[PDB]
């Protein structure tokens, strides 16, 4: 299904930081349409999105919680997953824009990721029948300085236990990680425990912009297979489908002029910005492709893109969520983010469902 | 006039081999018997007029012991009673189960007891006062091209392994000098003497087993039919007889695998020589069975030399190859069936039986 990507946006409000150092509002939501006032009051930029939420305030219409945003954005992808489609959602934006606060959220207001996860487990409960057997697995890993590390591993005891892995490209199913310890899911409780361990061990750190920053890229994969009956008088349960869900928490530019730092700090920031740039180029060429343009896609210019190839494009029903700030202090960043997103709507891939009727005759009969 | 039937009796797995969960390599398709390489390097097929598949009770066409007897061994009882000589060969490697087919078990008999008691009972069919019947038997072994009588009990001496010699009767055919005979009317007494016989038989503990056959054994039965006829006077002297010759051949064995020394190697050499000779002989007999005129090297060994008349002319015979199905002795099985086949061995290679599901070809067409 040559089909597009759902692009959603969430303007978080200002903070103690702006209260201490006054930073006016410039982002404005006409219900859902995004409008940004230049502090010079010379231009208003405006952007239109398939989805909007106005978390700037709780009161005016357009407001939405984590789960409102879920049932707007991610529950449909749950639907397409049970339809059998691979699915993607990934975040974008700067530091302190609640990109984690949205996707993952915290303990008290967890994000789209945990909402979807419990919805998925109970949605399997809805059809926990012998009509269709279900089997769910998940992996969870991180990207730091182009190095891949396993979030679900209890590290050993050593001064250096951040065991790197490497990537390999199956000629058919595409990239994957060696040693990636994909584990079985019984329920959202198990998912929760896994996520807790991983987010704990993630290489994150405090800084001058936020108390805790996602200095590494995080990937959270689920794959649900569902074995169903075929339409034959013989072995009926010989049909199966798979659906691969991919939820991605990226990092922010973290411009060093404000993110004054040194050593390993600046190193991580450099690698991050490099990665995100590569991603942006991927996104742009994808948009041009969706415009019908014959274009070479530098998936291979980094690791993030390479792994997420089949999700940024390929075969999956996908979405992006962009996080943006109201403070004029970072209006440039928010504008860049909004332009990224409004370009992002234009992207399409060709999404179907992964029966994998291999050595089955079912697809051939079909 | 003679003719031979060439057949094969497949053994099933043992408790040992089932415990190993040893792979099967022998399979059948009709009388055809195939061997599949474990690495599928070669899929061979040997062909027989008959195949005795005692691999699984549940299989279509299971051959039981009496099945074998009434399939291949029994007709020879008819022909021997008819009045021409009969023989049955058994050839196979150690552990194949030659005794299991031939002698069988004390509870599950073989073609030996089946034929013996059947022929007793079947001569009792015709036990008239017009015709007299008289039955004898002899039993001897060939070993290093030496003949030894199996019916003399060893004495309290270095040995009684007294070598004997072959002479060619000017009229009838070759026979053995000094061979003591006994007369029979009971298989119980057949067995009485055999108790001595297969004890005196020379044997050796190889690696393939603890008691291997290191000497060919020939067991023949003497059937005498004396009839009287109207001659315008005293009715007397119409004589017809026949012979029934059982051949417990010995296994070949590659000396390269039987790494050893001395007398063991000598016996292996002699045995292989005999087998080769016999293979030549039998093939020649087949070619004449199709009518090819040809010279026969009967004289190249003692065994065939004795059997010459039992093999030629009006002579009905069969040979049973014994084999094991297990993947582990696959080489031995291929060897055995190769000896057994009388035209050639088929071979190919094929790893396409998996059409990935339910004959995908039916869709691809
Ligand atoms: N719209 C919002 N409404 C209420 N609270 C918010 C909102 N957005 C963010 N927050 C909170 O403010 C804090 C700032 O967000 P923060 O988690 O630092 O962004 P982030 O996703 O960490 N960016 P990065 O660290 O670069 O990945 C978070 O701890 C949230 O709990
Ligand atoms: N068709 C069969 N069904 C069941 N068991 C069999 C069959 N053929 C052989 N066996 C077993 O294998 C053995 C074959 O005869 P036996 O002489 O006892 O073993 P062996 O070592 O093969 N002796 P040999 O006759 O000299 O090969 C028997 O002891 C049986 O228990
Ligand atoms: Mg974050
Ligand atoms: Mg045996």
Curated annotation (Swiss-Prot), chain A:
Domain Kinesin motor: 4-347
Phenotype of gene-disrupted mutants: The lag homozygous mutant mice that lack detectable Kif14 expression are indistinguishable from normal littermates at birth. At P10, mutants exhibit an overt ataxic phenotype that increased in severity over time. At P12, lag homozygous mutant mice are unable to stand for 10 s on a narrow platform. Their gait is wide and uncoordinated, and they frequently fell on their backs while walking. These defects in voluntary movement control, posture and balance are accompanied by progressive weakness and failure to gain body weight.
Tree of life domain: Eukaryota
Subcellular localization, as worded in the UniProt entry: Nucleus; Cytoplasm; Cytoplasm, Cytoskeleton, Spindle; Midbody
Similarity comment: family membership: Belongs to the TRAFAC class myosin-kinesin ATPase superfamily. Kinesin family.
Subunit composition and interactions: Directly interacts with PRC1 within a complex also containing KIF4A, KIF20A and KIF23; targets to the central spindle. Directly interacts with CIT depending on the activation state of the kinase (stronger interaction with the kinase-dead form); targets to the midbody. Interacts with ARRB2; the interaction is detected in the nucleus upon OR1D2 stimulation. Interacts with AKT1; the interaction is detected in the plasma membrane upon INS stimulation and promotes AKT1 phosphorylation. Interacts with SVIL; at midbody during cytokinesis.
Protein name: Kinesin-like protein KIF14
Native organism: Mus musculus
Lineage: Eukaryota, Metazoa, Chordata, Craniata, Vertebrata
